[PDB]
Amino acid sequence: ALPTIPYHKLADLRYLSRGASGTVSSARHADWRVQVAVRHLHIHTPLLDSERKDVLREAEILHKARFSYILPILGICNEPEFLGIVTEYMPNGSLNELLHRKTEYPDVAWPLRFRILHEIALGVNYLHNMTPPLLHHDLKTQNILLDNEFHVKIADFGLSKWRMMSLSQSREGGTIIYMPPENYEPRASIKHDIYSYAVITWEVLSRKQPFEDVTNPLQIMYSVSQGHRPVINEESLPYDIPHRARMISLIESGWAQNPDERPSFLKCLIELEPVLRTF
Incomplete structure (x- = not known):
């Protein structure tokens, strides 16, 4: 039940920060006309059918979390060379x-x-x-x-098989x-x-x-x-x-x-x- 946001709907990608779990960028959703945050991976090595369906199933599980004090997953950006998690943008940082x-x-x-x-x-x-x-x-x-x-x-709960992916795309630490x-x-x-x-x-x-x-x-x-x-x-x-x-x-x-x-x-x-x- 997790929507796919195509890459092209995310305009004005400003880099904010990077860590173990990927890169954090702000973006404007072209249809909603609000700011969103996106946690994403530029995937260097091609990625097996088994390995991709894994990360997607995780994201799908994490999508089910809907609660006032949880940052909800809004959708997954699933491109051949790019994986992204789209969430509400948090104006006041951490x-x-x-x-x-x-x-x-x-x-x-x-x-x-x-x-x-x-x-x-x-x-x-x-x-x-x-x-x-x-x-x-x-x-x-x-x-x-x-x-x-x-x-x-x-934010960033349950990012287990996701974090093993941003492991894979190396060959620092939190x-x-x-x-x-x-x-x-x-x-x-x-x-x-x-x-x-x-x-x-x-x-x-x-x-x-x-x-x-x-x-x-x-x-x-x-x-x-x-x-x-x-x-x-x-x-x-x-x-x-x-x-x-x-x-x-x-x-x-x-x-x-x-x-x-x-x-x-x-x-x-x-x-x-x-x-x-x-x-």
Whole structure:
């Protein structure tokens, strides 16, 4: 039930960014007369009938996700030399930008930070409650996209066989700060996303870069496999943070070394719901 958008309907392709999962461009849809984003791959090697139908079936599965805080797939661009995922364009970039561009936003109020946290949690919760469940497996501040009025849309969920394609078209690497230590030695584990969520939650409340001072990413990887985490004290997480106790609980249970110890997103929601009634 996933539409095919022909290449020619996407005008004014401006490059925005590239990573493991391909290139991100803005475009104008010629018929809808709105802006769209497109994640795409220029495919160098020809691509087997088996391998193409795989990526399409994935995209078709991911198309089924329709929820307020999920960035929905609008259609697939399926060209001989070009594969593309067309999504709504998000004017305000990512959560990454809202937190760390401290010049452009000197002040990110508590009610907003907490609404973001709630919406991420509702998003991943929805994803996990699909049949079959849809796991994100690369949740990070860059995927948490912000619409015109700073509401959350989670992007790039379930891009598994897609990411193996942009692997193939090489013959660099994405951030590991939100990756649970089990995953370092490659899996199908429901408790991956909650680890990421926990690190995100730390980042949202601290407004600090996780492992900021640690220069080598392998250093980070060793540290966390030995159970080290972003530091929780008065400097990183000030005493004035609303519901500080409850949030630290959520964070620590979230990034627990043992997967079994980590909450479901339903558990986050139950815990968060009281916090939000404050605002």
